[PDB]
Design a protein around this ligand. Structure first.
Ligand code: SF4
Ligand code: SF4
Ligand code: SF4
Ligand code: SF4
Ligand code: FES
Ligand SMILES: [K+]
Ligand SMILES: [Zn+2]
Lengths: 688, 77, 114, 83, 125, 106, 48, 95, 206
C-alpha cells in the first residue's frame, strides 16, 4: 500500500518510500557502479561513480544517495549516464599509480574492473602524478596510500562498525590525505576488515603480501572456530596450501566481517604441527612410530581398563563427529567420564534442557531488543562479531546497554552497574533502579558470559541471572515468543559437547582420577599429571604440539578445522559444517577416523564407517546437530528456573573480572593462535 | 580484403586426381598474382583494432598511462 | 512418463538382447584367447565376461539396457575384427594395478580417501 | 544398568503434543527423583518424538512416542527406569 | 511410438565413470559467495556443483602440487538448484544443497548522517 | 643495469601461459622487495609462443635467441629460477641488442 | 661485435659455456622454495 | 651472497638448501646444484642513493620504454629514503 | 566508425523473411526462428523433424542447401535435454547459410541424417564418440576418435579434462598398460570471471 512505482529503463518496480535510486536498480538486477557506497556503512556520496540520469532531468543524480521519487524513470545505460561514468573514471585514474603488477589488489580490484566495464580505454592525462607518503598503522594492515582514492570507506567503517574514531582526512583539496595524522596503530579486533572494504590496494593484508593472485586461488567455504560465533569464511588455497581467510556473508551471524583472530591466525596452522604418531621409548622420550604400533599401544591399555579408570577431556576446537566417536568408545568400556575443559554448572537442569546453555535470543535477535544486560563478560574479545552486532543496535535502534562486571571498553557507551555479583540480587528484588528499566522493556535481553561461569560460584551466578530473567517474564511485559535468558559462549566446541551429553568441566576427573586419560585437543592445562596417579596413561589427539602433547604417553596426529569436514555448533545452537580445504599434513588423520580405527583394534568396533554414518549417529543423539544453518528453538525456561532454585549456593564476594581485559589478551587464546607468528606480532605491537 | 584483389578460380572438367593436381598448381599461380597486388596496395596505419578493451595497448603506453596498464593487466589475465 | 524407445519396448525384450550378446561374447572368448595369444585361460576370459554382465544386473530401464548392449556389441566388434590390440583386450584384467585396500583400517593406514 | 535418557520431540507437531505436555508438567519431578541421571531433552522441528535409553557398555534401545499422551509418556519412562 | 518408463532416471552404468568416483564422492550444490574483496555481484548469479577436496602432495622433483583426484577441477554450472539436484541424481552422486544467501534490503538514508538527537549522526565526512 | 631482478612476481606470464608451463611463488624479500621464490618453466610443456614476454610489464621474462639446448634427459628441461637467471646472465648481451632492435615494433 | 660491441654489464658472464648436457656440470632441477609446514619437536627431557 | 651449509651444499638466493637428512640431495651426486651467484638483493644495495631537489620524483627504471611502468615516489619523510617498488633504486630529498 | 563491425540490414531482412518462410511451411516441427545481430539464421526444431526439415532445406527450390558444412553437439548440463544438435548447411545456389538445431538427452535416439547428407556419416560417429548421443539407423555407428575400449564421452562438461586413465609401457607384462591417472602437476583451475556485468543488453530478468 505504501509502495510507490518507479521505472528502471522503463521497467516498473514497486519500492518502499526512502529507497535510493541505486536500491531501485538492484531490484531489477542492475548493479550501479560504485566506490564510496557500501550498504553496511553510512551513505557518503563523494566518489560520484554512481551518477545516473533521470529521464526528463537535466542533472544526473548520485544513485547511492538520492531517494527515488514516484514516477521517475532511471536510465542506467543512457548516453548521459555512460559519459558521466567515463568522466569520473578518468578523474579517478589521473593520479592513480601504475602499480597493478606490484599491487596485491590486482586481479580482484574494483578500480580495475569498473575501469574495464565503465571507463574509457586510454589516457589523455599528460601531467605528473600525485605521490603520498605511507602511514604505519600496525602489523596487520599495510598502507600504500598513493593508491587511495579517498572513498572514506575505512573512515566510516572504523567509526561506525568498530567504534574507533582514529581514522580521518587531513588537508584539503587534491592534497587531502586519509590517515591518523599522528603516528598511531589501528589495532582493533575488527581492524582487518578495512582491507576488504578498501576498494583499491591502498590497504592490504601484511601477512598475505605478494604471495598469491586472486585468479589462481581455490575457494573453500567453511566455518571459523576461533570463537563460538561460527563466523562464515572462505579459505583461499593454492596448490594445496592455505593462503588467506576471507569473510563469507551470513546476515544472521557475521554479516560480512570477521575478527582479526579469525582473519590472521591461519599461519599458526603451519607451525608446531603434529604430523606423525609418537610413543615413549625406553628413555621416556616421544619418538615417531607407525599408526599400527601407536594404536596397538592405546588399544591394549584401553582393553585393560573399565568404568572410572578411563576418562577423556575435549578441547576447545574439537568437532562433533570426534566428540561422539570418543563418547561412544568410552561408553563401550562403561565409562561416562566425558569432560570438557569449559565449565557449565550442572546444578538443576544442567545440560538437560538446551535453553539452559544457548544464546536463546539469537545473534540477529539483538537488533530487535531494546535493553541488553551484559553480566560478567567482555563480548568485544569473547565474541567480537557478537559485540559488533550490539554496537549496530546501539547505533541504529538506540539500544540501551548495561554491564555488570569490569568497566571494559566495548566501543560504545553503556551504563556500568558495578562488578559485584550482588547487584544481581538487587535487580531481582527490585531495589536497584535498573530493575525498573527491565520491567518497562518490551524486549529485554539478559546475557551471561560463559567466562563468568568458570568461577566456583558459577551455579549461583547462573541462578541469580536466571532469577532476573524469570521475573521479567512474570511481569508479562514481554511478547511471549521473545526469550530473555542468554548464555554467550567463547569456545567453538562447547555447545556441541553439551548437546551430546558431555560433562561440562573436569570436576569428575578430579573426583575420580582415571588410570587412562584421552586428551582430545585439550590444551587448557586444566588437568596435569599432578592431578593423576603416577602411572596414568595419557593419550593426546590433536593437530598442534602445545600443552597436552608434551605430557602424553601416545600422540595421535589429528586434523585441523581447515583439513576436515566437521560439525560445529555456535553459541546460538546453530549447527554448521566445515569443508576440507587441504588435507592434514604428514601422517595426520581425520579425528573421528582415529577413534573409529582405534575401536576396531580394541575389538569394540563402532557402528559407523563413513562421514555420513557418523552424522547419522549424531542425529540419534541430538537431532539438531545435522540441521545445518538452522536455528532450532529451545523452550522450557520455566522448568529450568524451578530446578535452579532447589539448591541455594552463595555468591562469592569476588568482583566479576573478565579473563580478557585489554586487546593484548585477545590475540592468543588457543593452540592455533598461540602458534601464529602474526598473532605474536600483534601482541608485541600493542604491548610496546 | 579479398573483395579488393583480382584473381581467377581454376576449374576442373573431369573431377579426377589429374584435374585436382592442375587446379592446385594453377591456384599457386593465382596466389602469386594476389600477393603482387597485396604488396602494391598495402596501406599505412595501425595493425590491431584501436580498442584497448580487445587489443592490448602498445608497450610504451602500458608503461606510462594508467588506463593502458589496467587494460594490459586485464587482457593478459 | 512417455519416452522414445531405443530398441526394446520393455525389459523382457531388452533381456532377450542381453542374452544374445552374452552368447556372442561367450562363444568368441576361445577365438580371442587364440588370435591375441593371451596368457589367460578360456575360463578366465569367460569369467571376466560374466563379471562384466553381472555388475549391470540391477538395471530396470530398458533404454539403459539398450545402450549397454549397444556398447557391448561395439566392444565385441572391435575384438572380433582385431581392431583392438593385445593391450586393449588385457585392459579388462588390471594386471599391473596392485590391489587397493578395502577394509576401513587398511584405508585408514595409507591415506585419507574414504 | 541405565546410564542416560534422551527425549527427542518437535516443538509444534501435534504428534509430539503428549511429550511436550509431559515435559511441561512432569519433567521437573522426574529430575528431582533422579538427580544424577542425564535426561537429555532435545527439540528439533519435524521429528518423530522418541525415547532413547542407554545402558551399560553402550547398549541403546529406543521407544517411539509418536501421538502418545502425557500418561503414556510416563508409562514409557516407567519401563526404562526399572529396566 | 512412445513407451512408458517409470523407473528413476539413472545413467551411472553408461557414463564410464569408475565406481570409486561415483559412490565415494560428495557433490556440493551452492551459489558461490561474493568475493568480499570486491563489490561486484555478477559471480553470484548461477548455481555451482563442486566435489569434495582430496589430497595434494609435493612432487619430489620440482615441488609441484600433484594429485590423483580426476575430479579436482570439475565445476558445473546450473540455472537453478533443481537442475543441479537433477543432474547429481541421475549421475549417482550424493550431494548437499545449500540454500542461496541473499543480502537483505537495507534502509539507507543520507539525512541520518546529520541527526538532531540520534546516534546515527556522523562525526566526520 | 644495477643487477636487480626485473621480475616482480606479478604472475601475468603464468596467467596467460597457454600451456600452464610457468609455476611461480613469491614473498617479500629480506629488504621488503616483491620478488619470486619459485619461477619454473617446464620446457616440455611450453609451446614457445612468446605470450609470456608479451604479457610481462617489465621485460623480465623473454624468449632468447638460443635454440641449441637439447639435452640427454627429460629432467634437464625442467627449468627453475636459478637456471633461468643463469640463462639471462649468459645471454643478456645478445638479448638486449635484440630487444633494442624490435621494441619500437612492440 | 668488433664494430658494435655489446653493452657491458657487471653480471653478464665473462666466460661463455657450451651445452653441458651429459657431463658432471649438467643442470639438475630442484625446488627453490623452503619447507612450508614446520613439525613440532618433542622435548628432549623425559616426562610421561 | 652465496654460502654453503654444514653439508657444503650452496644456499640459493631464495634460501633453499637440503638439510642433513634429506635424501633428495642424492640428485646432485656426480653432478652439480645450479646456483646463480649474482644475488639481486646484494647488487641493488650497492647502488647509491640519488639526491634530488623535490618532494616527488619519478622512476621508470631507465631506458624509457625499456624500463618499468613510470611511478612517482614521495620523499617527505627524512627518516628513510624513497624506494622504487619496481627496480629498487633509492631517492632522497636534498637538505 | 573504424573499430565497430558494420551492420548489414539487407541481409538481416532477407534471412528474417526466409525464417518465416521455413516456419510457415513446416509448422509441425519448427519451435523457434531467430536471426543474430551478425546475420546468421537459426531454425530450432523438435527432434522428430530432423529428416523432414533437412530434406526440405536440401530439396526445396527456394532452399537448395545442398552442402552440410558441419554437424556437431553442445552439452548444456542444466537443461533437461542436455545435448543440442547443430546442423550447419550451405546453399550454393543462393549463396546463403542456415543453422538447424534440435535437442536430445542421454537415452533418447536421434534419427540419423545420412539419408539426407552422406557427409553426416562421420559427424554422427563423432557425436556418438564425444557426446554419447545415439543416432538411429546409422549405417555404422561406432567410435571414431577415441582409443579402442575407451570408456565415457570426453566432450561432456562433466568428463574431467585429463580423463580417468593414463597409459605407460610396463616391462613386467611387456605391453602398454592403462592405470588410474596421477599428475605430477595438477592442472591449475583459474577463476577469471569479473564480478561486474559486462553486457547489459544480455542481462537476464531476475
Ligand atoms: S588498486 Fe587496482 S588499479 Fe590501482 S594499482 Fe592496484 S590493482 Fe591497479
Ligand atoms: S584507504 Fe581505501 S577505504 Fe580508505 S579512503 Fe582510501 S581508498 Fe577508501
Ligand atoms: S612461450 Fe612457453 S612459457 Fe611463455 S607463454 Fe608460451 S607456452 Fe607459456
Ligand atoms: S616474469 Fe614478468 S610477467 Fe612473469 S611474474 Fe615476473 S614480472 Fe610478472
Ligand atoms: S557510490 Fe555514489 S557517490 Fe560514491
Ligand atoms: K583492499
Ligand atoms: Zn624504478
Amino acid at each position: 500500500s505504501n509502495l510507490i512505482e518507479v521505472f528502471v529503463d522503463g521497467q516498473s518496480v514497486m519500492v518502499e518510500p526512502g529507497t535510493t535510486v541505486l536500491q531501485a536498480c538492484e531490484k531489477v538486477g542492475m548493479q550501479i557502479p560504485r566506490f564510496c557506497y557500501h550498504e553496511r556503512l553510512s551513505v557518503a556520496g563523494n566518489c560520484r561513480m554512481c551518477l545516473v540520469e533521470i529521464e526528463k532531468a537535466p542533472k544526473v543524480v548520485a544513485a547511492c544517495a538520492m531517494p527515488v521519487m514516484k514516477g521517475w524513470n532511471i536510465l542506467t545505460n543512457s548516453e548521459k549516464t555512460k559519459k558521466a561514468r567515463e568522466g569520473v573514471m578518468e578523474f579517478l585514474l589521473a593520479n592513480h599509480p601504475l602499480d597493478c603488477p606490484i599491487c596485491d589488489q590486482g586481479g580482484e580490484c574494483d578500480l580495475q574492473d569498473q575501469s574495464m566495464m565503465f571507463g574509457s580505454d586510454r589516457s589523455r592525462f599528460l601531467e605528473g602524478k600525485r605521490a603520498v607518503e605511507d602511514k604505519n598503522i600496525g602489523p596487520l594492515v599495510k598502507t600504500i596510500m598513493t593508491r587511495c582514492i579517498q572513498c572514506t570507506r575505512c573512515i566510516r567503517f572504523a567509526s561506525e562498525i568498530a567504534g574507533v574514531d582514529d581514522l580521518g582526512t587531513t588537508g584539503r583539496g587534491n592534497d587531502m590525505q586519509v590517515g591518523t595524522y599522528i603516528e598511531k596503530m589501528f589495532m582493533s579486533e575488527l581492524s582487518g576488515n578495512i582491507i576488504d572494504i578498501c576498494p583499491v590496494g591502498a590497504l592490504t593484508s601484511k601477512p598475505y603480501a605478494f604471495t598469491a593472485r586472486p585468479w589462481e586461488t581455490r575457494k573453500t567455504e567453511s566455518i571459523d572456530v576461533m570463537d563460538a560465533v561460527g563466523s562464515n569464511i572462505v579459505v583461499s588455497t593454492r596448490t594445496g596450501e592455505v593462503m588467506r581467510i576471507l569473510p563469507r556473508m551470513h546476515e544472521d551471524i557475521n554479516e560480512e566481517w570477521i575478527s582479526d583472530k579469525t582473519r590472521f591466525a591461519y599461519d599458526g596452522l603451519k607451525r608446531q604441527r603434529l604430523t606423525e604418531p609418537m610413543v615413549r621409548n625406553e628413555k621416556g622420550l616421544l619418538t615417531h612410530t607407525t599408526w599400527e604400533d601407536a594404536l596397538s599401544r592405546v588399544a591394549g591399555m584401553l582393553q585393560s581398563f573399565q568404568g572410572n579408570d578411563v576418562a577423556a577431556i575435549a578441547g576447545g576446537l574439537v568437532d562433533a563427529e570426534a566428540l561422539i566417536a570418543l563418547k561412544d568408545l568410552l561408553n563401550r568400556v562403561d565409562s561416562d567420564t566425558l569432560c570438557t575443559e569449559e565449565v557449565f554448572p550442572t546444578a538443576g537442569a544442567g545440560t538437560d534442557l538446551r535453553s539452559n546453555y544457548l544464546l536463546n535470543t539469537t545473534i540477529a535477535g539483538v537488533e530487535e531488543a531494546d535493553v541488553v544486560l551484559l553480566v560478567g563478560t567482555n563480548p568485544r574479545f569473547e565474541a567480537p562479531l557478537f559485540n559488533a552486532r550490539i554496537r549496530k543496535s546501539w547505533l541504529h535502534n538506540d539500544l540501551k546497554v548495561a554491564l555488570i562486571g569490569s568497566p571494559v571498553d566495548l566501543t560504545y557507551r553503556y551504563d556500568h552497574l558495578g562488578d559485584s555479583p550482588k547487584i544481581l540480587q538487587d535487580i531481582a528484588s527490585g531495589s536497584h533502579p535498573f530493575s525498573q528499566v527491565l520491567q518497562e522493556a518490551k524486549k529485554p535481553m539478559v546475557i551471561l558470559g560463559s567466562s563468568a561461569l568458570q568461577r566456583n560460584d558459577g551455579a549461583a551466578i547462573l541462578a541469580a541471572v536466571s532469577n532476573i530473567a524469570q521475573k521479567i517474564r512474570t511481569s508479562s511485559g514481554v511478547t511471549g515468543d521473545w526469550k530473555v535468558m542468554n548464555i554467550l559462549h567463547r569456545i567453538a566446541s562447547q555447545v556441541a559437547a553439551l548437546d551430546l551429553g558431555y560433562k561440562p568441566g573436569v570436576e569428575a576427573i578430579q573426583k575420580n582420577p582415571p588410570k587412562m586419560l584421552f586428551l582430545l585437543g585439550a590444551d587448557g592445562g586444566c588437568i596435569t599429571r599432578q592431578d593423576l596417579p603416577k602411572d596414568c596413561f595419557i593419550v593426546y589427539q590433536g593437530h598442534h604440539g602445545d600443552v597436552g602433547a608434551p605430557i602424553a604417553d601416545v600422540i595421535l596426529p589429528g586434523a585441523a578445522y581447515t583439513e576436515k569436514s566437521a560439525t560445529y555448533v555456535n553459541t546460538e545452537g546453530r549447527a554448521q559444517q566445515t569443508k576440507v580445504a587441504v588435507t592434514p599434513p604428514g601422517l595426520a588423520r581425520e579425528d573421528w577416523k582415529i577413534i573409529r580405527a582405534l575401536s576396531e583394534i580394541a575389538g569394540m568396533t563402532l557402528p559407523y564407517d563413513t562421514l555420513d554414518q557418523v552424522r547419522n549417529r549424531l542425529e540419534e543423539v541430538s537431532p539438531n546437530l545435522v540441521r545445518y544453518d538452522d536455528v532450532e528453538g529451545a523452550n522450557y525456561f520455566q522448568q529450568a528456573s524451578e530446578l535452579s532454585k532447589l539448591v541455594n549456593q552463595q555468591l562469592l564476594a569476588d568482583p566479576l573480572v573478565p579473563p580478557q581485559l585489554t586487546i593484548k589478551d585477545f590475540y592468543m587464546t588457543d593452540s592455533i593462535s598461540r602458534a601464529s607468528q602474526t598473532m605474536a606480532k600483534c601482541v608485541k605491537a600493542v604491548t610496546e | 580484403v579479398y573483395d579488393q584483389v583480382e584473381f581467377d578460380v581454376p576449374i576442373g572438367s573431369r573431377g579426377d586426381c589429374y584435374d585436382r593436381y592442375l587446379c592446385r598448381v594453377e591456384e599457386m599461380r593465382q596466389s602469386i598474382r594476389i600477393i603482387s597486388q597485396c604488396l602494391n596496395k598495402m596501406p599505412p596505419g595501425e595493425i590491431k583494432v584501436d580498442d584497448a578493451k580487445v587489443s592490448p595497448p602498445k608497450r610504451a603506453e602500458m608503461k606510462t598511462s594508467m588506463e593502458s596498464l589496467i587494460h594490459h593487466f586485464k587482457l593478459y589475465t | 512418463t512417455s519416452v522414445k524407445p531405443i530398441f526394446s519396448r520393455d525389459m523382457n525384450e531388452a533381456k532377450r538382447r542381453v542374452r544374445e550378446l552374452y552368447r556372442a561374447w561367450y562363444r568368441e572368448v576361445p577365438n580371442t584367447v587364440h588370435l591375441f595369444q593371451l596368457d589367460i585361460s578360456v575360463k578366465q576370459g569367460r569369467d571376466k565376461v560374466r563379471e562384466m554382465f553381472k555388475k549391470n544386473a540391477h538395471i530396470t530401464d530398458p533404454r539403459v539396457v539398450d545402450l549397454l548392449v549397444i556398447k557391448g556389441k561395439m566392444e565385441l566388434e572391435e575384438t572380433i575384427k582385431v581392431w583392438k590390440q593385445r593391450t586393449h583386450v588385457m585392459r579388462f584384467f588390471h594386471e599391473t594395478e596392485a590391489p587397493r585396500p578395502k577394509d576401513f583400517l587398511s584405508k585408514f593406514y595409507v591415506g585419507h580417501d574414504p | 544398568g541405565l546410564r542416560e535418557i534422551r527425549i527427542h520431540l518437535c516443538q509444534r507437531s501435534p504428534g509430539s503434543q503428549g511429550v511436550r505436555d509431559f515435559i511441561e508438567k512432569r519433567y521437573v519431578e522426574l529430575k528431582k527423583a533422579n538427580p544424577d541421571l542425564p535426561i537429555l531433552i532435545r527439540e528439533c522441528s519435524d521429528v518423530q518424538p522418541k525415547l532413547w535409553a542407554r545402558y551399560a557398555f553402550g547398549q541403546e534401545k529406543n521407544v517411539s512416542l509418536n501421538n502418545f499422551s502425557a500418561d503414556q509418556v510416563t508409562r514409557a519412562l516407567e519401563n526404562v527406569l526399572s529396566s | 511410438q512412445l513407451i512408458t518408463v517409470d523407473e528413476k532416471l539413472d545413467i551411472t552404468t553408461i557414463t564410464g565413470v569408475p565406481e570409486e568416483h561415483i559412490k565415494t564422492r560428495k557433490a556440493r550444490i551452492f551459489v558461490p559467495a561474493r568475493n568480499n574483496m570486491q563489490s561486484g555481484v555478477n559471480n553470484t548469479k548461477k548455481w555451482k556443483m563442486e566435489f569434495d577436496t582430496r589430497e595434494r602432495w609435493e612432487n619430489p622433483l620440482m615441488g609441484w602440487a600433484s594429485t590423483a583426484d580426476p575430479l579436482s577441477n570439475l565445476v558445473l554450472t546450473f540455472s537453478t538448484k533443481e537442475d543441479a539436484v537433477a543432474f547429481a541424481e541421475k549421475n549417482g552422486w550424493s550431494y548437499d544443497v545449500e540454500e542461496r544467501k541473499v543480502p537483505k534490503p537495507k534502509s539507507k538514508s543520507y539525512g541520518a548522517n546529520f541527526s538532531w538527537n540520534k546516534r546515527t549522526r556522523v562525526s566526520t565526512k | 643495469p644495477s643487477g636487480e631482478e626485473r621480475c616482480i612476481a606479478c604472475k601475468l606470464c603464468e596467467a596467460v601461459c597457454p600451456a600452464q608451463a610457468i609455476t611461480i611463488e613469491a614473498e617479500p624479500r629480506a629488504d621488503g622487495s616483491r620478488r619470486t621464490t619459485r619461477y619454473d618453466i617446464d620446457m616440455t610443456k611450453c609451446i614457445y609462443c612468446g605470450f609470456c614476454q608479451e604479457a610481462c610489464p617489465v621485460d623480465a621474462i623473454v624468449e632468447g635467441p638460443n635454440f641449441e639446448f637439447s639435452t640427454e634427459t627429460h629432467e634437464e628441461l625442467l627449468y627453475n629460477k636459478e637456471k633461468l637467471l643463469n640463462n639471462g646472465d649468459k645471454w643478456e648481451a645478445e638479448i638486449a641488442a635484440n630487444i633494442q632492435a624490435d621494441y619500437l615494433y612492440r | 661485435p668488433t664494430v658494435k660491441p655489446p653493452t657491458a654489464r657487471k653480471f653478464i658472464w665473462t666466460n661463455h659455456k657450451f651445452n653441458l648436457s651429459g657431463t658432471p656440470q649438467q643442470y639438475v632441477p630442484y625446488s627453490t622454495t623452503r619447507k612450508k609446514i614446520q613439525e613440532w619437536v618433542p622435548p628432549s627431557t623425559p616426562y610421561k | 651472497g652465496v654460502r654453503t651449509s654444514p653439508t657444503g651444499e650452496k644456499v640459493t638466493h631464495t634460501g633453499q638448501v637440503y638439510d642433513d637428512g634429506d635424501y633428495r640431495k642424492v640428485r646432485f651426486v656426480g653432478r652439480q646444484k645450479e646456483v646463480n651467484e649474482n644475488f639481486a638483493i646484494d647488487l641493488i644495495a650497492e647502488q647509491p642513493v640519488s639526491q634530488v631537489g623535490s618532494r616527488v620524483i619519478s622512476c621508470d627504471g631507465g631506458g624509457g620504454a625499456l624500463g618499468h611502468p613510470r611511478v612517482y615516489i614521495n620523499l617527505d619523510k627524512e627518516t628513510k629514503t624513497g624506494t622504487c617498488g619496481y627496480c629498487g633504486l633509492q631517492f632522497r630529498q636534498q637538505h | 566508425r573504424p573499430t565497430v563491425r558494420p551492420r548489414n540490414d539487407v541481409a538481416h531482412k532477407q534471412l528474417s523473411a526466409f525464417g518465416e518462410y521455413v516456419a510457415e511451411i513446416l509448422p509441425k516441427y519448427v519451435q523457434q526462428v531467430q536471426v543474430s545481430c551478425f546475420n546468421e539464421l537459426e531454425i530450432c526444431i523438435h527432434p522428430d523433424g530432423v529428416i523432414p526439415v533437412l530434406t526440405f532445406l536440401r530439396d526445396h527450390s527456394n532452399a537448395q542447401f545442398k552442402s552440410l558444412a558441419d554437424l556437431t553437439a553442445v552439452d548444456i548440463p542444466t537443461r533437461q535435454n542436455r545435448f543440442e544438435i547443430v546442423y550447419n548447411l550451405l546453399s550454393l545456389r543462393f549463396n546463403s547459410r542456415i543453422r538447424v538445431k534440435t535437442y536430445t538427452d542421454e537415452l533418447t535416439p536421434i534419427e540419423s541424417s545420412v539419408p539426407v547428407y552422406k557427409a553426416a556419416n562421420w559427424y554422427e560417429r563423432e557425436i556418438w564418440d564425444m557426446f554419447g548421443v545415439f543416432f538411429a539407423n546409422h549405417p555404422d555407428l561406432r567410435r571414431i576418435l577415441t582409443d579402442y575400449g575407451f570408456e565415457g564421452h570426453p566432450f561432456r562438461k562433466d568428463f574431467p579434462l585429463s580423463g580417468y586413465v593414463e597409459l605407460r609401457y610396463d616391462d613386467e607384462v611387456k605391453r602398454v598398460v592403462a592405470e588410474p591417472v596421477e599428475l605430477a602437476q595438477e592442472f591449475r583451475k583459474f577463476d577469471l570471471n569479473s564480478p561486474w556485468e559486462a553486457f547489459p543488453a544480455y542481462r537476464q530478468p531476475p
